[PDB]
Amino acid sequence: MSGTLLAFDFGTKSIGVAVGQRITGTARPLPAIKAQDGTPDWNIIERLLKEWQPDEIIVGLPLNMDGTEQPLTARARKFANRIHGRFGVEVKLHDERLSTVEARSGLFEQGGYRALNKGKVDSASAVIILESYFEQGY
């Protein structure tokens, strides 16, 4: 089975992304969120997107402004609508569903789902956006 899919964490003039390959089940990291004068690496991703057939794409930059939910992402979701009409690819915007309910009747076991990480900024949120699509099975 094979289905190369992509996942980016970014927006205007910013490139922090993860590339996912559904051939072995791994996600490669895409360079740091710095596009050229507003030009995202379109030659870099497109080369790995079409050469391997883009099975699925997840795009959007989730950033906390005050630490909690952030209504500013509304501009992020629309960004996903841009890369879509640009190449005509099936892109999906990642929504912050982890922060929706107020009560605490879900995450009860404070110990679990551990993950070695202190604070990396190497487009890890994208491979996280990427790891999010694996949960949607799309």
Swiss-Prot record:
GO terms for cellular component: cytoplasm. Changing residue 103 to I: Allows cell growth, i.e. not toxic. The keyword Hydrolase applies. Changing residue 96 to A: Does not process pre-16S rRNA in 70S ribosomes. Disruption phenotype: Essential, it cannot be disrupted. Its EC number is 3.1.-.-. GO terms for biological process: DNA damage response; ribosome biogenesis; rRNA 5'-end processing; transcription antitermination. Keywords: Cytoplasm, Hydrolase, Nuclease, Ribosome biogenesis. Its main location: cytoplasm. It is found in: Cytoplasm. Changing residue 9 to A: Does not process pre-16S rRNA in 70S ribosomes, binds to pre-16S rRNA-containing ribosomes. Monomer. HAMAP family: Nuclease_YqgF (MF_00651). Belongs to the YqgF nuclease family. Involved in the processing of the 5'-end of pre-16S rRNA during 70S ribosome maturation (processing does not occur on total cellular RNA off the ribosome); may be a nuclease. A temperature-sensitive yqgF mutant no longer grows when Rho or NusA are overproduced, and has reduced transcription of genes encoded downstream of Rho terminators; transcription increases again in the presence of the Rho inhibitor bicylomycin. This is Putative pre-16S rRNA nuclease. It comes from Escherichia coli (strain K12).
